[PDB]
Ligand binder design. Structure first.
Ligand SMILES: *C(=N)[C@H](C[C@@H]1CCNC1=O)NC(=O)[C@H](CC(C)C)NC(=O)c1ccc(-c2ccc(OC)c(OC)c2)cc1
Ligand SMILES: *C(=N)[C@H](C[C@@H]1CCNC1=O)NC(=O)[C@H](CC(C)C)NC(=O)c1ccc(-c2ccc(OC)c(OC)c2)cc1
Lengths: 304, 304
């Protein structure tokens, strides 16, 4: 009965990772059915990444310029189209390991597992959150583009993220599986100012609930607050304003711990204004905000 | 170019997870070749866990009392033997998804990925470290026993851990894949005092090196120390004594950052004696010690 940052089992996703090569650039691709999805800047020369006119680059590209490798057995491309910042390649073979899958655009605050890939082979898996400024604080090196972010519900994989770029502040930006960027970002080597990153307030509260479940409960005080007053101090500390919707999501958690949601906001209020005083909650000296209420429940329920 | 707690891709391991049921108790099993490994306390009734005489329990067990399920297709047991705290069942079918595998006993401080399973289906994956007192601080609920810990080197899976038990301090204990417990623990519902948990000193230094690689470098001071003097303050702070062996492991990291290992020990010395002063390193306000020098390199190298 512990609590750690968990990631979805990656097996169902590794069976879709291929290596896509165009010219000299090589990256990762997602092979579902007879289609392979990859970032469109695979057609970019290392000097064209400064200001690329992607439309006048794809016209000079034919099918045979794309070398799709799934393991040491390569795939023949038959058709290729572009959708926003994603490239779609039609291959003469449907991936026999294709799972039940879905393309969903997630919302700021939601979490997902990331399968970091290099040259089409998986290197590792870790859990990420979509920050309110639509960036993510992942770990990515050269060739990691095309690695995807995903959730798993029983047997169906929800593909929500594909890696594209690293921002000047060290964080990361990418697109949904339809090629549409999360946030006001474009595939272009230029300084792109990410917005101010607020803290996902509803996630911090769910994390504090997972602590009470896990014996760590020194932070519960004898105070209380209202949703309006708690919100007022939350904006001074760059926290997301808590809505009645958020309160209702935490409700299941509130029911299992017997601590009203508004009373937990009170303990978080005094925690924000007075600090942890060198103490730690669930082995961290910071307030963690990359655990959605859903994540806490499924971890304390053994959801498979 | 970020740094997060990564876990090995789990795909090669999920293909070995089965459900093992004996009487009413049901847990997870590791199906490699024509053998299935599982914790021996599957033969334990919920009242016999207080003081179980495992030898006089296995004799009253035959082959047909063990229901091995791999998915919704069940396996017939033909032979069963006991090895320390592990149970081995001979099945009439070799697992066609068996990988290149190995059974290795790891050492305190080493890290491995954990595939948390329930009813034979995987629920998630996270990274763990073998604490110097031979416990681990994982996340485990009822039915998680038989979940394994593993490392992956190219194509070969190194099975090092199998979950057995939770200790009173909230941490976890288990065996190697030969049934031999890590530490002075036994499979028995009784208060088992874990030893004092020291901090894996060599791991903290490697983590500080990953920070310098990642731009976070406010902690490097203009001081220096010797291995002997640094060790003296390390024992007052319950840190593992640093050996010349540890220094040589960090060497590759020392070479990439240009910071002598002994100078990094100096920065860690003053960090231990003066605190972070509310600052954070790599997004944590604590000194992290679950990153081996190997883990840092492979993450900054894209090892697949
Ligand atoms: C995909 N394979 C990579 C993955 C990146 C590179 C290494 N780590 C990653 O996460 N994608 C890219 O390299 C894209 C190429 C585009 C899509 C054509 N570009 C970038 O990731 C990138 C990095 C850095 C800057 C940058 C410019 C100017 C700065 O000064 C203010 C600055 O400050 C640090 C950064 C731009 C684009
Ligand atoms: C396997 N399926 C489980 C997994 C455990 C239970 C829930 N979380 C886990 O990690 N294994 C067990 O339940 C084993 C059974 C043995 C091997 C026959 N036992 C325990 O995990 C266990 C838990 C707690 C105690 C305990 C006793 C006395 C205390 O008071 C001082 C105390 O303090 C908290 C704890 C013993 C054994």
């Amino acid at each position: 009965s512990g609590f750690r940052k968990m990631a979805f089992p990656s097996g169902k996703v590794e069976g879709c990772m291929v290596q896509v090569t165009c010219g000299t650039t090589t990256l990762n691709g997602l092979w579902l059915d007879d289609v392979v999805y990859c970032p469109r800047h695979v057609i970019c020369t290392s000097e064209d990444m400064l200001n690329p006119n992607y439309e006048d680059l794809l016209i000079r590209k034919s099918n045979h310029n794309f070398l799709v490798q799934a393991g040491n057995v390569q795939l023949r491309v038959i058709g290729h189209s572009m959708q926003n910042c994603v490239l779609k390649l039609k291959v003469d073979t449907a991936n026999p390991k294709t799972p039940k899958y879905k393309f969903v655009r997630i919302q700021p605050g939601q979490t997902f597992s990331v399968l970091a890939c290099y040259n089409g082979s998986p290197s590792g898996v870790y859990q990420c959150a979509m920050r309110p400024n639509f960036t993510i604080k992942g770990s990515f090196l050269n060739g990691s583009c095309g690695s995807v972010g995903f959730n798993i519900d029983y047997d169906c994989v929800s593909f929500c993220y594909m890696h594209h770029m690293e921002l000047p502040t060290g964080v990361h930006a990418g697109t949904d599986l339809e090629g549409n960027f999360y946030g006001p970002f474009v595939d272009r080597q230029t300084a792109q100012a990410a917005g101010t990153d607020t803290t996902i307030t509803v996630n911090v509260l769910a994390w504090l609930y997972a602590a009470v479940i896990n014996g760590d409960r020194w932070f519960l005080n004898r105070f209380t607050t209202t949703l309006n007053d708690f919100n007022l101090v939350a904006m001074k500390y760059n926290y997301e304003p808590l809505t009645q919707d958020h309160v209702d999501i935490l409700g299941p958690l509130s029911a299992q711990t017997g601590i009203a949601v508004l009373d937990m906001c009170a303990s978080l209020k005094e925690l924000l204004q007075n600090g942890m005083n060198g103490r730690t909650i669930l082995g961290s000296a910071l307030l963690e905000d990359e655990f959605t209420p859903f994540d806490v429940v499924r971890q304390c329920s053994g959801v498979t």
